[PDB]
Structure formats: structure tokens, C-alpha cells
């Protein structure tokens, strides 16, 4: 696309020639693939292999700054978020750059923004929230027509982080008043309220009965839902930007906003640096199978790292700062967001 001098397809040249005739006046980019049999990556000489290659294959134009992204591979669509609304794209067609979304969901209300979004693991619902809005809404995607099905109330609150757990039917959210609220999707009723810290918590991670939260105060805390026990605090030297949780093994990945990554274990207080940069990490995302992770930073770079020690397999440069990334469940596609655009790469290994 942008990196190449000019992206062309195989029928595009014949179309150009026929247009020239009418008007009287490798080399070919490929489309993305879904079938495992056509993936055909040669054996090295479901799978825990570390990737080895990247190639950009589409560009999405949103018309304004991009705040958050999400990608589904069971259903091919992609979701982009901005301060005015949410746009749904489709990855089934073939084109270098697309301007025509599959749908647009606008939010019109005096002084109503958006900041966050979240897609459920089964691909059947989507959570939305922002500033000065009445409540956090959920959308039903399995229906023959998109529509809101529930409304999770919050009065005079400005949310900044969302998370959802589907096995127990819970929903989580954090607000700028240092309050974390829990809701039940069966009753849409508030369950339990966590409070006591003024700065708030920028990122939240939920697995099992543990809630991990960290923010500019340079501390990480663990809350338990079963009891009302006080959280356990681990002190660091810099402010946390993002968090993620290793699915297979007990390891919490966190970025320190001074270009330093760490791993922390729930069972014991062990730490060890796994990477260092001169930038500020704005996001860390973790692969579904747990063997690698992606990191996007302020100094215009997308990097892929290796779990055992943190060695970086490779990286890609970009013109404008990136602020969000997301990895598919097939472990083959990854989507980042910079400027007013979102780009789609493919993973081959």
C-alpha cells in the first residue's frame, strides 16, 4: 500500500487498458486468506510457533482521529471508534483502500463524546461509553438488524476503561472518580462498588476473581470479588500505561511509559525487564496462545516480541504515532491505528 510505490491487482491492469481503449486517449498485491489449507507455511527446518513475517494488505479511512479498534475473525468485520461515532467495516472484498463502511452508528447529544469500546469473545455484543453520556450501552450483533438491547446506568460519571466477563455474566467499568462498578447482564443491576483512590485507574484486567488495575500513581493492585479484602499493592518507579494478562501462564505484562516492559506474577513478587525503548509505550497486547505479544509506542513503531526472554523478532516503521493495536483470535491478523487511519497486516509463520 503506502509503503510500496503503487499497489496493483491482476484485473486492475486489464481494466486500465480497456479504459484507455474506450476513452480514445512480488509485483501483484494479494488478498487475505482464511482457509487453513491455503495458508501453506513451510515447516521450519493449536500451534505455539513464534511468527516471522508481516505484510500490510489494506487501509481504512475514518475521517477523524481513531481512539480504539477491535477485530473479529469469526465474522470478518472490523470496528473503529472516534469522538463522534463507531464505523463497521468488512474484510471480504478486494480493494487497496476503502471509503465505504458497512455501517455507521452515530451518537448525537450536546457535548457527548466517546472514548472506549470492547467486543465480546463470542462476537455477539459490543460495549460503548464515554463522557457526559447517560449510560453505557450494549449492541446486539447476532440480530438481523443492529440495535441497542440494554442500558447500564451511571449518573454524572465519565468512564475511561471497559472490561467484560462472559462465563459469569458480569460487566466492569472504571470512572474518572476512582470508582469501579460491576453490573449483571441478567438484571442490569449494580452489584458491588470499589472505591478509595483519587487518580482513578486507566487500565483494568479481569480473569477469575482477580481485578488488576494500574495508573499514574505507579502502583498495581489486585481486588477479589468474593471478599471485601483490601487490595495488594506493588510499587514501581514510573507510571503505567497499559496492561495485559497471559492466558496460559500466570504473568501480567505492563508498560511503564519510560520505554520499559516488565512481567509480574500473581503467586509471588518476581520481576524482570523484558525490553527497553526510548519511547513511551501506549499499548501492549498479548497473543491468544500466549507465546508472543505486540507493542505500539510513541516513537512510530510496531514491534513483535518473544515470550521466554523478550527478544524482538522484528518490527515495522510508520509515519504517524500509533495509539492502539489488537490481535485476532486466529492468531493471523493484527490491526493498528494511527492518525486518521487503521491498517490491517497478516501474520505468516
Amino acid at each position: 500500500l503506502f509503503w510500496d510505490k503503487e499497489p496493483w491487482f491482476w484485473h486492475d491492469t486489464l481494466t486500465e487498458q480497456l479504459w484507455r481503449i474506450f476513452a480514445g486517449v512480488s509485483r501483484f498485491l494479494q488478498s487475505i486468506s482464511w482457509d487453513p489449507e491455503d495458508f501453506e507455511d513451510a515447516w521450519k527446518r493449536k500451534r505455539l510457533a513464534v511468527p516471522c513475517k508481516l505484510e500490510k494488505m489494506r487501509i481504512l479511512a475514518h475521517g477523524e482521529l481513531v481512539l480504539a479498534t477491535a477485530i473479529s475473525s469469526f465474522t470478518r468485520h472490523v470496528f473503529t471508534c472516534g469522538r463522534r461515532g463507531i464505523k463497521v467495516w468488512s474484510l471480504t472484498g478486494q480493494v487497496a483502500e476503502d471509503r465505504f463502511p458497512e455501517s455507521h452508528l452515530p451518537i448525537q447529544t450536546p457535548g457527548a463524546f466517546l472514548r472506549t469500546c470492547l467486543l465480546s469473545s463470542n462476537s455477539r455484543s459490543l460495549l460503548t461509553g464515554g463522557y457526559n453520556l447517560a449510560s453505557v450501552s450494549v449492541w446486539d450483533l447476532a440480530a438481523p438488524s443492529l440495535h441497542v438491547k440494554e442500558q447500564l446506568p451511571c449518573a454524572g460519571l465519565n468512564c475511561q476503561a471497559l472490561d467484560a466477563n462472559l462465563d459469569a455474566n458480569l460487566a466492569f467499568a472504571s470512572f474518572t472518580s476512582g470508582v469501579v462498578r460491576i453490573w449483571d447482564l441478567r438484571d442490569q443491576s449494580v452489584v458491588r462498588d470499589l472505591k478509595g483512590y483519587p487518580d482513578g485507574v486507566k487500565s483494568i484486567v479481569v480473569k477469575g476473581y482477580n481485578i488488576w488495575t494500574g495508573g499514574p500513581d505507579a502502583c498495581l493492585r489486585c481486588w477479589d470479588q468474593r471478599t471485601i479484602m483490601k487490595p495488594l499493592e506493588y510499587q514501581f518507579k514510573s507510571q503505567i500505561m497499559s496492561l495485559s494478562h497471559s492466558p496460559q501462564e500466570d504473568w501480567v505484562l505492563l508498560g511503564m511509559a519510560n520505554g520499559q516492559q516488565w512481567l509480574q506474577s500473581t503467586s509471588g513478587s518476581q520481576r524482570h525487564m523484558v525490553g527497553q525503548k526510548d519511547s513511551v509505550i501506549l499499548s501492549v497486547k498479548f497473543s491468544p496462545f500466549g507465546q508472543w505479544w505486540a507493542s505500539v509506542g510513541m516513537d512510530d513503531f510496531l514491534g513483535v516480541y518473544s515470550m521466554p526472554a523478550g527478544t524482538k523478532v522484528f518490527e515495522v516503521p510508520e509515519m504517524s504515532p500509533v495509539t492502539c493495536c489488537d490481535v485476532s483470535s486466529n492468531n493471523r491478523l493484527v490491526v493498528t491505528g494511527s492518525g486518521e487511519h487503521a491498517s490491517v497486516y497478516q501474520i505468516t509463520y
Binding site: 468485520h77 472484498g93 450483533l141 440480530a143 438481523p144 438488524s145 443492529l146
Partner: protein, 93 residues
Amino acid sequence: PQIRIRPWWFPVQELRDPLVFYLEAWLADELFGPDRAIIPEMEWTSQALLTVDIVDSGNLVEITVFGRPRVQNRVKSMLLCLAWFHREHRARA
């Protein structure tokens, strides 16, 4: 002219090149039920759209599948296997 609802997630492009095969009327009756209330769930899980119709004589049922050709072949094989199970079950009793 026949008018059918289509979901928002099924792209218009895939509507091209449908697949057609016939089965018995009663056999389709136990497969789908007299109400056909399971078709939306099957469509969502398979990401493909089906359609069941009955000939005026009431002997044959025409089934059409929308989607990529491998998906159509897979769904056809699955339905044929279930049809054989029901036929042999009827033969047993």
C-alpha cells in the same frame, strides 16, 4: 417473486451462485420441525443462509444454500448424513 429477510452481517456479494438439492417432505419435517424455529441459530453458527420450500404436490423439498462453495459442500454433506440417520431410524421402527 419470493421475498426473504437477510441479516446485516451476510454480505451481498456471497448471494451469487447458490446450491440446490432436494429431499423428502416428511424427512425435512423431522429435520427442521413444523415451525422451522432453529434455522436462525443454524445460520449464525454456520455463517450461511438456508431456505426451505415445499412443492405443491408435497413430495419434494427444495433446499438452497448461500455462501462460499466449500461451506455449501460441507453443509450439504452434513444434512445428507443427518437425513440418512433419520431414514434408517424410521426403517428400524
